[PDB]
Amino acid sequence: APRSVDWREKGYVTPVKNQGQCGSCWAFSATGALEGQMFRKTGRLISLSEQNLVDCSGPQGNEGCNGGLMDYAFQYVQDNGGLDSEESYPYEATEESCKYNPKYSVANDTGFVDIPKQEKALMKAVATVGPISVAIDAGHESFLFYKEGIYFEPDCSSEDMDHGVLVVGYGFESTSDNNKYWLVKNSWGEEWGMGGYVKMAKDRRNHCGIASAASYPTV
Numbered sequence: 339a340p341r342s343v344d345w346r347e348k349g350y351v352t353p354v355k356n357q358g359q360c361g362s363c364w365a366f367s368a369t370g371a372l373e374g375q376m377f378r379k380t381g382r383l384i385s386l387s388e389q390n391l392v393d394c395s396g397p398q399g400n401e402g403c404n405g406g407l408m409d410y411a412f413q414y415v416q417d418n419g420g421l422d423s424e425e426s427y428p429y430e431a432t433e434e435s436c437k438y439n440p441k442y443s444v445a446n447d448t449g450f451v452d453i454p455k456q457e458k459a460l461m462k463a464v465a466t467v468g469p470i471s472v473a474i475d476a477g478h479e480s481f482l483f484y485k486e487g488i489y490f491e492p493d494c495s496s497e498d499m500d501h502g503v504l505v506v507g508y509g510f511e512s513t514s515d516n517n518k519y520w521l522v523k524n525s526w527g528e529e530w531g532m533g534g535y536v537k538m539a540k541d542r543r544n545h546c547g548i549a550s551a552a553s554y555p556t557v
């Protein structure tokens with residue numbers, strides 16, 4: 339695997355979005371990964387509807403603004419046979435009745451792959467697949483008010499993950515102990531962190547659980 343990967347450099351990643359006051363992180367992490375795989379497949383980068391997932395993927399186990407899972411979202415897209423564009427079904431930060439329209443479907447997937455729960459397995463996936471949906475422990479004020487640099491929270495849990503985000507690459511901080519990081523796309527707007535991104539400690543014992551719930555859709 340390469341020592342450094344950053345899929346934003348190759349056009350795989352839409353601009354940072356903002357979930358607002360809705361527990362819909364799972365939907366944004368899911369659209370992020372599917373946007374990456376659809377771009378690899380077609381060469382077209384098209385923003386996808388988190389609202390479609392919020393309103394319609396209840397049968398697969400998601401709960402709208404009361405949470406969900408990226409794998410459930412990938413299953414909905416497979417079950418449903420498509421997912422609408424962001425443009426045609428824009429984000430509302432509240433759940434309403436399902437309004438999926440196949441006429442505006444711009445994506446599909448055939449399932450998903452759950453990655454083994456090891457950071458080096460996550461590294462290979464990021465290097466060979468593209469952006470990867472992951473779960474992290476985001477429940478600390480150090481993370482809420484994160485500004486820049488490599489985030490490391492000694493109290494972070496590797497099993498109490500609560501926030502779905504997107505790993506778009508990894509790297510190392512030039513000038514050899516605790517220098518590696520994951521490049522993570524968050525869904526809290528472009529003002530949060532580093533243009534919406536956070537560098538999360540890598541190879542420091544699965545910090546904040548980043549490798550415990552990693553997955554991507556198959557297209």
Ligand SMILES: *[C@@H](C(=O)OCC)[C@H](O)C(=O)N[C@@H](CC(C)C)C(=O)NCCC(C)C
Nearest residue numbers: 361362363364401405406407473500501502
């Ligand atoms: C994520 C979120 O929006 O928090 C940022 C404020 C949601 O809380 C959420 O869906 N969390 C989720 C696990 C993530 C995807 C790692 C969860 O708790 N799922 C179980 C709840 C059930 C509705 C599936």
